[PDB]
Write a protein that binds this ligand. Structure first.
Ligand SMILES: COc1ccc(NC(=O)N2CCC(C)CC2)cc1
Ligand SMILES: COc1ccc(NC(=O)N2CCC(C)CC2)cc1
Lengths: 193, 193
């Protein structure tokens, strides 16, 4: 079970580097995984379900990395604190660009992909707002915008900006500049009065 | 010519308030415009071409409003200067939410829609960077990030945040909060050291 499922998922991630999900057949997935087509349908109903599982894996990888960071004591340097956090997403999604690209596109056509992304964005926004609230409570950040509203716009900026950078969209921030760009906007907007 | 073309465009904008372009037929468009199907094909090749023209109209409306603002002397109050500028996009796109929603979705499936949006984003980013550069030259803004990179992330934030707000996505900034939210992040990031 585990082994043939993992092989299908690995094959899908590899083929999505070359082409979009529309141009990948179940035959391609079964062939890559060394199984028959009917055996593929035992593990997944569709190529779309495979992408959902890949995206779920990547999103939970980012979330579990963020939880690991949240568990350790807080970085005493506020800019570095936020940079290490944004970097979890930069490195996790940047290490899975094909799944990232395909998953964002699938939000349009898949309610399960749209709901997965929504769910995790709400969790990441809530956490961001809780950190901003803690910074205000300790007198390290000014009481300016509603923290949850600020957190929402900053998280949406990172969603759009990181995906544009990884896809090489025109326009985009160069990948080698995007972490510095986003940290600057987070720190100035969280700590600026 | 002008009159039947305008009627098709008006019908399309009206029907997109009720449903997506996928659920609107050429019959629906011709019927709404008081023409036959074959007469529709004289003016446009597809329902997709109608949406392209609607989006083109809206994007050029925003751009021409921004040009009008760019022509007048600069607002002496830096926060108000940026607020009046962001408000051009808030009001223009917010007044055409059905075309906005349908056009953003069509970027996925239409190279002409994707190129239209890209073209105008590059123009708006260039203008933003030129204003930031002028603010630095006059000693009103600090020389922090590369202006074009800062401008790119701020414009992508507005793209994603305003569209989420107008679509009522979860998550989103409430529409009644989104202008204040974005102005705060632009002003703190442009003027913060
Ligand atoms: C590609 O999509 C996203 C990429 C990044 C984000 N969010 C973040 O960077 N953080 C920064 C650190 C914070 C404590 C949690 C949120 C959201 C979406
Ligand atoms: C919905 O998509 C966008 C909505 C807004 C923008 N950009 C802007 O707000 N401005 C602010 C003022 C500046 C001088 C030009 C750019 C881009 C995309």
């Amino acid at each position: 079970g585990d082994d043939r499922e993992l092989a299908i998922l690995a094959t899908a991630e590899n083929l999505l580097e070359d082409r979009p999900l529309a141009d990948i057949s179940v035959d391609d997935l079964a062939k890559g995984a060394g199984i028959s087509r009917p055996t593929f349908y035992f593990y997944f109903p569709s190529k779309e379900a495979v992408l959902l599982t890949l995206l779920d894996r990547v999103v939970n990888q980012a979330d579990m990395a963020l939880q690991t960071l949240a568990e350790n004591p807080a970085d005493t340097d506020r800019e570095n604190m936020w940079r290490t956090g944004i970097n979890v997403f930069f490195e996790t999604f940047g290490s899975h660009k094909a799944v990232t690209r395909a998953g964002q596109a699938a939000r349009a056509t898949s309610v399960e992909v749209a709901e997965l992304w929504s769910t995790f964005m709400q969790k990441w926004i809530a956490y961001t707002a809780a950190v901003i609230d803690a910074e205000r409570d300790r007198g390290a950040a000014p009481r300016t915008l509603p923290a949850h509203e600020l957190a929402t716009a900053l998280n949406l900026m990172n969603e759009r900006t990181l995906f544009a950078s990884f896809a090489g969209e025109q326009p985009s921030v160069p990948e080698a500049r995007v972490l510095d760009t986003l940290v600057h906007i987070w720190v100035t907007s969280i700590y600026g009065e």
